[PDB]
Design an enzyme around this catalytic site. Sequence first.
Site, short mmCIF file in Angstrom:
data_model
loop_
_atom_site.label_atom_id
_atom_site.label_comp_id
_atom_site.label_asym_id
_atom_site.label_seq_id
_atom_site.Cartn_x
_atom_site.Cartn_y
_atom_site.Cartn_z
N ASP C 131 0.83 -1.20 0.00
CA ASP C 131 0.00 0.00 0.00
C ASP C 131 0.87 1.25 0.00
OD1 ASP C 131 -2.42 1.27 -0.19
OD2 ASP C 131 -2.94 1.08 1.93
N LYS C 133 1.66 4.69 -1.04
CA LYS C 133 0.87 5.80 -1.55
C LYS C 133 1.28 7.06 -0.80
CE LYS C 133 -2.98 4.20 1.35
NZ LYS C 133 -4.23 4.70 1.99
N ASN C 136 1.15 7.44 3.03
CA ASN C 136 2.08 6.68 3.84
C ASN C 136 3.52 7.16 3.71
OD1 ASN C 136 -0.03 5.02 4.75
ND2 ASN C 136 0.26 3.56 3.07
N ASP C 152 2.64 2.94 8.32
CA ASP C 152 1.40 2.18 8.22
C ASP C 152 1.59 0.83 7.53
OD1 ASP C 152 -1.21 1.40 8.31
OD2 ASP C 152 -2.02 3.31 7.58
N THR C 172 -4.37 0.36 -3.12
CA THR C 172 -5.11 1.54 -3.53
C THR C 172 -5.21 1.56 -5.05
OG1 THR C 172 -4.27 2.72 -1.60
CG2 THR C 172 -5.25 4.05 -3.36
#
Lengths: 438, 436, 436
Positions: C131, C133, C136, C152, C172
């Site tokens: 994840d 993105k 983060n 995260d 995502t």
Amino acid sequence: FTDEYQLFEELGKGAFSVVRRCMKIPTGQEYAAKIINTKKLSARDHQKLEREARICRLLKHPNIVRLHDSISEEGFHYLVFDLVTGGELFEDIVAREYYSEADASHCIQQILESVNHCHLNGIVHRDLKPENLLLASKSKGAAVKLADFGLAIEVQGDQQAWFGFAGTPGYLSPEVLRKDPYGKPVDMWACGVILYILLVGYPPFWDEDQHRLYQQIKAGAYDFPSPEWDTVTPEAKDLINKMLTINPAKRITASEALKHPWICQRSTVASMMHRQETVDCLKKFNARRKLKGAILTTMLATRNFSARKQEIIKVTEQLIEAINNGCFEAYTKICDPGLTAFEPEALGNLVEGMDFHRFYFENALSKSNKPIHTIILNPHVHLVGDDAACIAYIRLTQYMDGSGMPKTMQSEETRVWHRRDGKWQNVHFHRSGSPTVP
Amino acid sequence: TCTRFTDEYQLFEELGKGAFSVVRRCMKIPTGQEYAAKIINTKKLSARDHQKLEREARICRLLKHPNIVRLHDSISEEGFHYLVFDLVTGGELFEDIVAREYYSEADASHCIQQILESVNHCHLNGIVHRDLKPENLLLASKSKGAAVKLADFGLAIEVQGDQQAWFGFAGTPGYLSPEVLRKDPYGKPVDMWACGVILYILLVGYPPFWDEDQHRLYQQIKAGAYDFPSPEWDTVTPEAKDLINKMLTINPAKRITASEALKHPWICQRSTVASMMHRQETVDCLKKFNARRKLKGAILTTMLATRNFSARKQEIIKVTEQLIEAINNGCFEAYTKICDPGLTAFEPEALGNLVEGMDFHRFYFENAPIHTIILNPHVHLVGDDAACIAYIRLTQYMDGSGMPKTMQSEETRVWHRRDGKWQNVHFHRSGSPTVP
Amino acid sequence: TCTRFTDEYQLFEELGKGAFSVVRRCMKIPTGQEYAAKIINTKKLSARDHQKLEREARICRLLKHPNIVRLHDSISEEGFHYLVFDLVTGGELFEDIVAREYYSEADASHCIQQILESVNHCHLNGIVHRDLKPENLLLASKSKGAAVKLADFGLAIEVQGDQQAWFGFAGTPGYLSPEVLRKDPYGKPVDMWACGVILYILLVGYPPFWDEDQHRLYQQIKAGAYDFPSPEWDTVTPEAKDLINKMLTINPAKRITASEALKHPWICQRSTVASMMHRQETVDCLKKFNARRKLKGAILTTMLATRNFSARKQEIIKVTEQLIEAINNGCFEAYTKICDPGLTAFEPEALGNLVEGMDFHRFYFENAPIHTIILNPHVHLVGDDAACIAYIRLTQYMDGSGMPKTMQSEETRVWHRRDGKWQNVHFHRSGSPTVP
């Protein structure tokens, strides 16, 4: 109808009726045709339209909208009226560049001529108001025409009787507000109200609270405040006074007003000064009147309370608070010993005294330990004398149910209050809906 | 109340269906002359559809022009009603154009001339069509050179002289005029705006106003926001563009009339003004236009509205999501931050009453695994600082028995940006309460 | 089962909320050293969320790198659980960039280098973030020059060596890798695809893959359909474009790894390869990118899907509308033209049975004012000659009493183009029967 006449543009449309410009081809005329879809007309509406047509057929006068013909077809009745193009008299006045007492007197002369004709034919209009005062056309000197006899009654000579509470609040007569038998003079009171407005552009009786408005009318509580009335002639004030006479037996009649100097000697009596402040005020009067034009029955709560009414709200909330807190001492202090009650807990019986209510204090009201929140919605207070009052309100109760889930319940409650020994006390109450104990 | 039609006509297949009518091909037996018969059960005829039927018959009786589908007879057969029309067998004008090997401005001018002549005839008889569109522009027959014919007067109205009036919101979105979109009184000029849209399409093959968002489309139309992009328009005569501009005039009082348009050089001097260059790019584009129109043709009522939301609309969605989050988390501080202190609300918990303020809602924060879904949110922007949003609130939760359950409510929330912050001033919930 | 945290820490405000956790700022009392405390009720912890908690703790224990949010302690307090993390106070990297007065490729290269170093550290420990993105990618503090920190790990997984496997559809949409979208087994390379997306944004300020229709977006990603449009990309060094291409490689087996990317000239020879020209257009665009991302940030689950339907999807809507029209008109001929002879159907009228053929439906045509509305139709294209459509069928009608009424059913219809004609081979109705 198409038989003889010819239909054109629409001038309006009601619930059961549509009105269109018309022309009698055989004679090159031009009328207003009221096309009634008889299939939509109820029985009580059928009774009122039969009355309005019979009355209109009976009144033939220049200053009265004339009914020229009535004819039926396949579930479609036609009523041929005069074509009125000039709109409201009051709307025309605000558009004028000059306006004086002489202009107002010429108007009222025509209105009195129509009222006198109605009365001479045993007919009372009962709803004289600006909306029913129209100009035949937009011509510079068009004639004022009385319109809409939907509330008109047929009277027997000069016999008074109670024909019902009808009219428009600001123009209702004292005798109707007193619930007395009445007759032709109710129209002359309305004329006096209209004449007052025609001179200064605001009504002689006005109040946000209708109850107060009606008290003013019954008391004849109007005056001629300075400065605007300082320039009005004595004769115009005199004619108003004689029309706004509380006692209808002593009120000037239509025949008599037509002989008043301000009416029949206008040239020498009525002022010819321009009253711009009347035009400016009439503009506001007309604007408010078109905003308040309720197309439908509108019921607005009460939110501007006198100190007396707030006193009743306060003691009512003190009583509810005592119930919620299970304070029987406060309850018996606020409630009359001879209290009666209708409530769901009583299963349709009228209960008397404190016994029935003592049970819920001695047990639930303090025994149960759960949070409850009471809301009082839209209280309405009637003051019925210096020491008596009535309050009606919705009682919304939020609480926790057995499973610990939030719930809401509604009751409607009336409480009658009597001030005894200087303390407002509850002598009777009526609860409908849910019972106050969850 | 006669029996002329059944005793003098013969019926055949259906050609189209109407709201209250069926159109069938027919033949007058004595003469073998064929027509299109529009049939109605006098039973169907309600006071409304009976007044509409009377209006269509009265209007069509007046119209007797070569480029208009003529009405030949109106018969009431004591149980039915029959309107006998010309039988049109040429299909749509726009379908015919794409099949031609040569098509130029001059051809388009000839088409628009016949269309204007039909419209001019209507207006001179005090009749406004209100629904000029390709589907109503037919060819009298499949013969080469057949006449363009204006069809379908089911939305037509009668006007009194040059007097404007509100006759209702009717028409087809792409051809609606600014005055109708503004809710102004209108009249004959609405047909001339539509003619401008049709002429624009006849030249390049695509409409001047197009948008998937109907609200944006209408704002384009009301602004007159069209142009003549290159290269396709670089080869178009200035006189053609000029006539379009005079038709697509925002102010109907300054818009060219049907009579004036027929005098325009590009029309009445077509042999001298209109280009005869073939426009293959227009034929190609028109084929796409017709294919698209045929797919979207009005069959049944279809509703679908969750477009590429604007940033302004997304802001309302976000603050609404933040509000529901605060509720689900029982955060009353955040709730009173987002909701106006004078908040009003209809909701099932209030038992039909309108509640005001924060008190009623505090009870649920103070006393009472959740998944909230916001389905099909719709946002109306009602000023730079105001909006309302409407959505389905679908909540999954676990019940007392430890079992999963779902509840639905429908919610409206009105938003006002006060002191720089979107705040909820009113909401209306229907369906289930928000608490299990 | 200890009591270390409550007896050695002090709690303060909340900084963020999780699915099963709350993150609060805290302080170790003896030392005054502040941290971010992730707290969980051991009550909440189901077998799933307990295994997730164990996974996050085990994974974060392994990660000790300057550019990763470090885990400092894991305490079970006999009723609660506390994960003590570094407190990050710098906000998001992308927010910081827009506020700078000077920003060039060299700055972007420095950012990507730290990001790759954090990713490289994860992969070398057999951990895939999944994840990556902007949300983060945080800055350790507000101090100028603060380190980029990867945050995260709630979606992170553990891999065995270089073995690929299906760990679920997570991530995502804009940063998902082709292999996940293809439902292929995957591993460390998914993070490197995401890094390519992030690097593309760091250079020009907008993503390489964007579409309001998520299905189209995913097909863009799976096709690797991005480019370097002029003019913004004309000033970008070839080495920057080259590194992006090696990250946005469709085949994960040929995609550059974190270690290899750190050796790329544009990274490890940044002083020589990366341009130092300020890129104001990138700062401007990034400000838009951040504003858009902030509006669409995941708050609550939102569903909205009625995009600008394609012609292929409109064709399915049209034939479905034609079918319902035939039903409402009781035209059985048209019904048997559109429906396959081997049609099957679930419907309330069949009382839970699957019926086959035309017989069951003929009964309603032979024996039994209507307005049908098709609400929120959704079309899946399942080949050039197959599709299914799902819609709410909302029917207004008059009842026996002459009163208006509305009924709702939900309908699925499967379509197969046979002999050049869309034909309905199966349908499923739930809710009300279609007959009053």
